Enzyme design. Sequence first.
Site, PDB file in Angstrom:
ATOM      1  N   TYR A  51       0.841  -1.194   0.000  1.00 11.28           N
ATOM      2  CA  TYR A  51       0.000   0.000   0.000  1.00 11.28           C
ATOM      3  C   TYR A  51       0.878   1.247   0.000  1.00 11.28           C
ATOM      4  CZ  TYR A  51      -3.328   3.566   1.554  1.00 11.28           C
ATOM      5  OH  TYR A  51      -4.090   4.707   1.663  1.00 11.28           O
ATOM      6  N   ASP A  68       9.157   2.504  -0.430  1.00 11.10           N
ATOM      7  CA  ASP A  68       8.142   3.228   0.297  1.00 11.10           C
ATOM      8  C   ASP A  68       8.430   2.890   1.756  1.00 11.10           C
ATOM      9  OD1 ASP A  68       5.982   4.016   1.766  1.00 11.10           O
ATOM     10  OD2 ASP A  68       4.500   3.417   0.266  1.00 11.10           O
ATOM     11  N   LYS A  73       4.730   9.170   8.627  1.00  8.49           N
ATOM     12  CA  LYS A  73       4.488   8.778  10.003  1.00  8.49           C
ATOM     13  C   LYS A  73       5.507   9.300  11.016  1.00  8.49           C
ATOM     14  CE  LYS A  73       2.295   4.748   7.997  1.00  8.49           C
ATOM     15  NZ  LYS A  73       0.894   4.805   8.483  1.00  8.49           N
TER      16      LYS A  73
HETATM   17  C1  PXG Z   1       3.994   1.541   3.125  1.00 10.90           C
HETATM   18  C2  PXG Z   1       3.040   2.689   3.203  1.00 10.90           C
HETATM   19  N1  PXG Z   1       3.153   3.710   2.243  1.00 10.90           N
HETATM   20  C3  PXG Z   1       2.267   4.804   2.345  1.00 10.90           C
HETATM   21  C4  PXG Z   1       1.275   4.919   3.367  1.00 10.90           C
HETATM   22  C5  PXG Z   1       0.535   6.270   3.455  1.00 10.90           C
HETATM   23  O1  PXG Z   1       0.812   7.470   4.387  1.00 10.90           O
HETATM   24  P1  PXG Z   1      -0.508   8.243   4.836  1.00 10.90           P
HETATM   25  O2  PXG Z   1      -1.540   7.287   5.313  1.00 10.90           O
HETATM   26  O3  PXG Z   1       0.077   9.279   5.773  1.00 10.90           O
HETATM   27  O4  PXG Z   1      -1.147   9.056   3.521  1.00 10.90           O
HETATM   28  C6  PXG Z   1       1.158   3.856   4.332  1.00 10.90           C
HETATM   29  C7  PXG Z   1       0.070   3.798   5.511  1.00 10.90           C
HETATM   30  N2  PXG Z   1      -0.002   2.929   6.683  1.00 10.90           N
HETATM   31  C8  PXG Z   1      -1.292   2.739   7.121  1.00 10.90           C
HETATM   32  C9  PXG Z   1      -1.556   1.541   7.692  1.00 10.90           C
HETATM   33  C10 PXG Z   1      -2.921   1.215   8.243  1.00 10.90           C
HETATM   34  C11 PXG Z   1      -3.988   2.170   8.110  1.00 10.90           C
HETATM   35  C12 PXG Z   1      -3.731   3.401   7.526  1.00 10.90           C
HETATM   36  C13 PXG Z   1      -4.903   4.378   7.438  1.00 10.90           C
HETATM   37  O5  PXG Z   1      -4.987   5.255   6.571  1.00 10.90           O
HETATM   38  O6  PXG Z   1      -5.856   4.385   8.227  1.00 10.90           O
HETATM   39  C14 PXG Z   1      -2.395   3.711   7.028  1.00 10.90           C
HETATM   40  C15 PXG Z   1       2.042   2.781   4.232  1.00 10.90           C
HETATM   41  O7  PXG Z   1       1.936   1.833   5.169  1.00 10.90           O
END
Ligand code: PXG
EC number: 5.4.3.8
Lengths: 427, 427
Positions: free
Chosen positions: A144, A239, A267
């Site tokens: 993701y 990523d 994060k």
């Molecule tokens: C590997 C990876 N790359 C990009 C993102 C995105 O960053 P932002 O979410 O700040 O736009 C992630 C996100 N990691 C993650 C894991 C579980 C839930 C959620 C949620 O949006 O509720 C997000 C991630 O795990």
Amino acid sequence: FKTIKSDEIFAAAQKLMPGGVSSPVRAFKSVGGQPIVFDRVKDAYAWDVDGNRYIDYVGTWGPAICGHAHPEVIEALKVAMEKGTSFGAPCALENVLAEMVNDAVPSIEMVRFVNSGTEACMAVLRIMRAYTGRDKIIKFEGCYHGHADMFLVKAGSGVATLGLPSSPGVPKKTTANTLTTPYNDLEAVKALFAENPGEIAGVILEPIVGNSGFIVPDAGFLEGLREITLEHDALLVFDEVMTGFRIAYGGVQEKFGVTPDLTTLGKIIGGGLPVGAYGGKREIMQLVAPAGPMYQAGTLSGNPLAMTAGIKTLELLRQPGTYEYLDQITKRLSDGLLAIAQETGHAACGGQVSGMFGFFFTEGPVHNYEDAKKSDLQKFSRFHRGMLEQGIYLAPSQFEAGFTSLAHTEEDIDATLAAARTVMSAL
Amino acid sequence: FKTIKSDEIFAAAQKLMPGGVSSPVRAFKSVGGQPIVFDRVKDAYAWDVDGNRYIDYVGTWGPAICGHAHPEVIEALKVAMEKGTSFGAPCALENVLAEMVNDAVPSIEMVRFVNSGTEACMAVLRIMRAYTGRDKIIKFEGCYHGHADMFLVKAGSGVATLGLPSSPGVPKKTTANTLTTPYNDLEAVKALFAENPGEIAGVILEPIVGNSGFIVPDAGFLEGLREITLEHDALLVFDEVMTGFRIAYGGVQEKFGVTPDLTTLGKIIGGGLPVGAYGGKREIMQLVAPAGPMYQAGTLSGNPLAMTAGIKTLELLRQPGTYEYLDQITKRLSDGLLAIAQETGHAACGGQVSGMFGFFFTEGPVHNYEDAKKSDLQKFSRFHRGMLEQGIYLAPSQFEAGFTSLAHTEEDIDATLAAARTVMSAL
Ligand SMILES: Cc1ncc(COP(=O)(O)O)c(CNc2cccc(C(=O)O)c2)c1O
Ligand SMILES: Cc1ncc(COP(=O)(O)O)c(CNc2cccc(C(=O)O)c2)c1O
């Protein structure tokens, strides 16, 4: 175990916001559909709006590696906001964090701060193409990297949970420029290049997967990817929004010794505030406006508050024994959970690397998203609820990695294993 | 007028970040190239890292409508961060701000918070298509809706200011679905539908343009757009990231009485922190995960700090005479600037609506991006630098609207007009 207040608030939320949440996974859909509303968080704990206290293993999904509301971070923020929270103009703090990030991440020679991991990924996707002049991108099933139109395909997180593949929302054309392959499958990747000569801008992936459960790369996987990309003049993009500053100060690329061309961060870099970043080789970053033609902007990008939080967070991480401590308590947790599973007769597998761990209800082993999907979601659901009632807060999803923080103590771990034993003894 | 410290910091920044900035426009490229590094902001002022004080008309590009570092906002933030800055789970504050936003914006019945205007626009673009099942979108030349790929076509803001073409890195396959038309040109729009029967998902636009200079819609433009969209079952989307809560509590849609189907919000809603939001008719918002199939997530979305800042900001805007005051002092400023231009023999035009104004060095009038481009950028550059030296900070771009805040006093306005007279007397 009362959740009366959480239920009230969540019920109301559903009338104001889609699914009554600001983010899908928070709806607890994959684990019963009964989320708890947090009131406050501190150190390694989270408190219910009902007074219930939990040992938190979500850490607001990555940022809270130093523990929630770390005293030094909040104090730094308290002082910085006296000067204003956003300038809309350059500030000295952007220079500081930028330097710290460049020094910390191997691949990063130049950085551009943004406001989220999604913005970072979105931007990095664009220079991959801008820089190479190619349109096709390779991503892996289960991974993701935010959401968009020509990229949201067999993604992770809320997507790689209910069997959700790509879209809906995007046009049945955009995604054509996004090639998918199983994680840990070098052959599939080579096949993709072989089938699209001179069309692949590069490969983007979670160096260590966290969005299809915790999945580490098999020996030679990352290296293979690096080699093939070099071979076809394609970019290798890591990523590390989730792995960055968690697996190691320099992330997975530092830990496993593989240097990508571009890296996305998020994060932790925001220390609790909305912050994202993308950086890599200088020659590539040079295309980013106003230095280059590829446009990417952000009103709040580099705001003084976010920079302050990021700086203080990184400073804390640079202290002695930070990652050793994380590995120590997390291995204890990970092994303990697995032992208890063995002891209680439940098929399980998992692992941990630094303050990041995974636990699947399947004998596995798990090498990719397909393996992860064999997990007994029914059991996980009961396990998660059971742990919640025991005061342990785990990711409300079998496909999300768990997190540890510097605030978690040995006692918190033991209390968690005691709880786990109690819960798995039932199930 | 010393800028020694700003120069040092900016020089160093260029080695760490693309163009030495987190956002293109901050680079001063088209206005001198010597940006000034802010140290702190307060009320209607900004302070150089060199000690220079300026009356700020940029307001960190929209958010600071209540004035920089508003006491009640920072105090609210100080208290909230004690509870942690991010939960990764629902919190009561999301419900509060969501309710406030639904009540404030006519078109919004359900809201989803995100972290920036870019994320909001990106997401809204996706449900427009998801909801209508069509792929083509109509946007206007000069309008800016973040850097989501589909929007990088005839973009305003930084793209325009930098005289940048449609950004590279975005697949032709994706840009092909973006239909453009000059702003205020209803006929061009009708022609687009006529030429693409059953293919237009909708039209997105800045109800009042701020990214190609300040441009108000001609009589019947917005209404016409509303009517044609209804006619072809297409969505009318208002990007009020900039106009929202500034032109009016309910934005341009409230002010001019035209209700879109979806609305994007940002800047002010975050009160100084990274916050964005998109909402509209419930039936459309229902497609947003986890309520519907269109996936859109955000780790820091709806975080307690942002919510707190947004809430406090909106509460201050709800106070009596807020917008009357903004209109009053801004008209004074706008008219004054024009009178001085007339008096000093410089061709000029502009206007203001509430705390938003524009001033072009061209007789105009300006009805669209093409008109705006006729402005004497050479003169603007000198004017901007001259004002800076007189202690007035204006948007370093002829194509960016200026902003007023509740903290700007009548005296600040007079000091600005005095400075304006002095500067234009030269030129
Ligand atoms: C590997 C990876 N790359 C990009 C993102 C995105 O960053 P932002 O979410 O700040 O736009 C992630 C996100 N990691 C993650 C894991 C579980 C839930 C959620 C949620 O949006 O509720 C997000 C991630 O795990
Ligand atoms: C009408 C409109 N829609 C969307 C955006 C995007 O939101 P974010 O910028 O939060 O991603 C805008 C932005 N407005 C704006 C104007 C001038 C500078 C900058 C800059 O990125 O440096 C931004 C805007 O003015």
